[PDB]
Amino acid sequence: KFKTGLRRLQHRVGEIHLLREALQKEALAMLLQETTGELEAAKALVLKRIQIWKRQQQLAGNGAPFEESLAPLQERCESLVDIYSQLQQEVGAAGTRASLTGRLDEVLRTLVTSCFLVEKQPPQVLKTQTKFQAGVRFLLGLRFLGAPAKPPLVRADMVTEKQARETGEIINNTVPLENSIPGNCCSALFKNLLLKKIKRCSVTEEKCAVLFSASFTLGPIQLQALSLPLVVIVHGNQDNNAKATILWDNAFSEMDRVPFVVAERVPWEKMCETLNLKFMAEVGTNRGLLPEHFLFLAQKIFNDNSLSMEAFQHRSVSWSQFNKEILLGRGFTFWQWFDGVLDLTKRCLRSYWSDRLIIGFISKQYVTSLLLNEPDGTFLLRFSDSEIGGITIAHVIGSPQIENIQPFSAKDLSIRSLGDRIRDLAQLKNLYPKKPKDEAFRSHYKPEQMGGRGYVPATIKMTVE
Amino acid sequence: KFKTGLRRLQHRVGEIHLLREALQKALAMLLQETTGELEAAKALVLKRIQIWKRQQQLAGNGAPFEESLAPLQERCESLVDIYSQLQQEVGAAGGETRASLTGRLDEVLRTLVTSCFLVEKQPPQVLKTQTKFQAGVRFLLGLRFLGPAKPPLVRADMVTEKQARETGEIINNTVPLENSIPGNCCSALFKNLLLKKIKRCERKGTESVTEEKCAVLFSASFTLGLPIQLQALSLPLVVIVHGNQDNNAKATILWDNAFSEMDRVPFVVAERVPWEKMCETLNLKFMAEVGTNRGLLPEHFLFLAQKIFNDNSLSMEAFQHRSVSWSQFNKEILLGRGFTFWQWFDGVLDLTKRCLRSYWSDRLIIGFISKQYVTSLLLNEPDGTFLLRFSDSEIGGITIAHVIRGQDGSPQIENIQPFSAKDLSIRSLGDRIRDLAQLKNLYPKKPKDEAFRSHYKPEQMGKDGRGYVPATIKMTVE
């Protein structure tokens, strides 16, 4: 946060300057070594803060806060390159160290090579024969003024995880890296990228990346940048699996790693925070999941039936448990079910969810426990465990019993929204607990268009018995 | 019959043989006679070919077709056999001088051959760019040439209407013209054709892109021994570049396939035609496209006449001697509406094709009826009597019109919002009609639970898979 150290650096440059002008009528002039050392300190710090920005970008993909801007980083790097410039310029004196110029040049080169970033990441789930965009940024672009004034060219090529550790073809891969004096930025934006074909080398688990290469002239520096890991797909059906992989990699990944290694097993609450974040960001609400939801999720993925939330907390979940092992009694993985719920809730249940009308994540046994002691016509809404992306009405009605209504798909809710569907059922009197349905659903109801012209409108209603 | 005519020519050939071997121990004018009878026969066969093409022309709109070329091929083969035997008998000197005899024989041969090159499988008459289509060309005298012989290759090229009177390019346009001993056929089949782009020819007032007629030209060369070039032209087709154009393109083709003379300058068609011709075309297209033999009735033709002509006349005989123009058909917007006559009609075709197909055949749908005649009919009928009519305001929709008298009983008519094909996909017409308690009788009196009992779908009881209770949706009106 403190640039004060920089104000120590340039001032030290001042000291060197005046000292040089003192010998204008051998000496030390040891301050150059000193100052250069503090420069390497500054550079290292800015480099690791860059790496921080990168991991923040990584987390942003799953649904987490991001800076997002690089302008401060750019200003810092610019200042460091400034002091570098005046130092190197000051080296020009009669007062002969190969180390001064040699070290300064490696400071410059590491700063430059690390200032080559992927500002706009390509899609982390990528379909072949579909067009996507990516954006690369150079922070020290306006410091090279341009002195050559001739733009380097950045090429983008697809690489496997193996080639990442140091085929498939992409089109319109060459774009010039250009300086923009307004906007203060040195960027290259690939806006018409397309993948013609890829070598596959469990399909939705192979991590690939886009490699942005360039050449930079001064006085021969090769610039390399690697995008976030991405999963290549060839049809929409694979998407639902691909996300999981990406979801796993964007979180749970250390800042420095061999591309692209990630833990096979992780703490359960880490997974809970990941699910909460992804849920809130993807659906688009600030009303996240609750501890009970995490409990009923926990039993679901673990095939357990404990009613104490803390036993699960010290459990660990593996990638296999997450998206490679089939749930008991069912035909899908945990993740597939969860993502199905994500889709349904995003498209048709966002207002309903934010209003807290949906209990959602509950075993129907806890539902029995709750509803059995309730008056006739009390109901609650639960996500269906049998099918993917479905929601079911559970209500209590000869004695007292409870009825589970066939789950609504996104299609079903598109035909008639959940709200008016609920309005249709007069047998439903109160939303759990003890809340009148006609108050908490007045906004979701749509006003009748009775009357023209010149036809009477025919409406569709849901009924069950 | 035509075969008596064939064996008379051939018997004359026998006589020619015996006469020749008699005069080898002078006319011999009988050869001209026989030649005269051959050219007659050839002409007839040619005209029968011209018939087939026209049937094919009609077939594209939806009319019966009898598709094999094998009989025609048999005719042509026997005929060229006769040609060969005449030409062969000509080589007696002579007669013991006349070049003209063989000269006529050779034109018999060449006209027959060039006319034996047909487009058996027609390309789509509505053609989308960058979409794959197929075409099939046939040579009838193919199994005669060759019996050893290098098979020719047929080239397919796109041509405008102007070039037909004598321009995008196609991919994989070369295919060898091959003989097949089984099937007894000499055909060339283009199975991977593609139009990359098209350049649209003309000034376009008042025309529309989608009104411009193009064709595929099939060319070949034949090496016998003598230099005969084979060209065949397909039916006119309209090239499109997006689905929105289809419903208009079709109209053009519909107009062009009918109303076209058997021999014509490509591709001229009458701009105006008798109304009853239009009725026959509309009925045929309806039956073929929907897929029923239950065609239109005089009342339907009356309300259609009123619609397209803007004539509130109630006499079927007035319209009978009227003429309808292309402009009225698909270039003039209907009064009060945003679409042409044809667009509405095609909407109805689509609706009836996808849904209401069984319903129409059961004669449950009157369909083409003015709301005035509806009012006339329904006012007197009992409470809850209804009928189903196609919406004139909307495209591809059908509406229930029913009457409520009450105990007073002042009878008014209630017109229910038209059902789209989508709406019927959500819940069938049958189940929709069942859902409303009020509708008691189909017109005139037929009980609703009798005339729709086959169309009803069985209700599922709340048993559960599952275990769960099913929720179904029903239609209601208020």
Place this chain on the structure above:
DNA sequence: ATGGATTTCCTAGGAAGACAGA
């Protein structure tokens, strides 16, 4: 033979850029 992955193929249709309009 069923079924589950994986991929090239096809298709309608929305959205929006490009093209004229005596």
Place this chain on the structure above:
DNA sequence: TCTGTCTTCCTAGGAAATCCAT
């Protein structure tokens, strides 16, 4: 300058080959 024609761009699925496996 604009509107309606025309066109190009682009894409979420549906039908269905290839191939593989305690």
